[PDB]
Design a protein around this ligand. Structure first.
Ligand SMILES: Nc1ncnc2c1ncn2[C@@H]1O[C@H](CSCC[C@H](N)C(=O)O)[C@@H](O)[C@H]1O
Ligand SMILES: [Ca+2]
Length: 213
């Protein structure tokens, strides 16, 4: 039900989450240590586990209530740990082969995003990857209205319950998105040697930075 509702709310869920899993699987070994930042109920971690059965996953979030759903999702998994931490709290020591995030970093002020990308690179192995499945802003107000129409079109086409879309619109008041190319440049500023947008559906995009590749 929860997972079904995320697909109803998020355009191109399989393309965007799938692209995150694929780019990690082509960038790190089977036995990678992976941090999922703002893991929530652990959906991105779960997508990674399906492809990488031997990866060690650390799921981190500020919300014990969200992480309880992740604990249930990963009940029988001996290679998953859970950590309660804000993005602005001290990160785990690492090192990590990959740091991944979905629909979380857009909650931070822009300066805190720029600092976070830098802090993430410091806990990555050389050649390590940062991947974000993210809600992004259009480059202009007029395009932002078109992004909004395309998002609403997916939500309506998916037969999303009206109450859940209303609750979605209210949660989105707290969002601090920026355009995808600005955030990709922030990865270059943080010292990532390569950064790219792998996949995009208007308001939603999967992008990555490599720490030396
Ligand atoms: N500053 C912050 N530090 C840590 N987690 C944060 C945060 N701001 C928001 N979050 C978390 O970010 C998540 C956004 S919802 C996305 C959850 C999950 N990554 C998924 O793809 O389904 C929530 O679990 C919320 O608690
Ligand atoms: Ca949000």
């Amino acid at each position: 039900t929860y997972d079904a509702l995320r697909r109803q709310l998020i355009p191109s869920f399989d393309l965007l989450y799938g692209s995150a899993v694929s780019v990690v699987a082509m960038s790190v070994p089977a036995t990678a240590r992976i941090l999922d930042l703002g893991a929530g109920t652990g959906l991105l971690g779960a997508a990674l586990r399906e492809r990488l059965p031997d990866a060690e996953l650390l799921l981190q979030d500020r919300s014990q209530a969200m992480l309880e759903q992740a604990r249930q999702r990963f009940a029988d998994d001996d290679q998953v740990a859970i950590r309660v931490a804000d993005h602005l709290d001290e990160l785990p020591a690492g090192p990590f082969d990959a740091v991944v995030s979905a629909l979380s970093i857009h909650h931070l002020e822009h300066q805190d995003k720029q600092d976070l990308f830098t802090r993430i690179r410091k806990i990555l192995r050389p050649g390590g990857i940062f991947v974000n499945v993210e809600q992004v802003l259009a480059p202009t107000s007029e395009l932002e209205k078109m992004y909004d129409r395309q998002h609403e079109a997916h939500v309506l086409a998916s037969d999303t319950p009206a109450e859940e879309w209303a609750a979605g619109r209210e949660r989105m008041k707290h969002d601090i998105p920026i355009d995808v190319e600005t955030q990709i440049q922030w990865l270059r500023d943080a010292g990532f040697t390569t950064a790219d947008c792998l996949a995009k559906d208007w308001r939603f995009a999967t992008y990555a930075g490599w720490n030396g590749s």
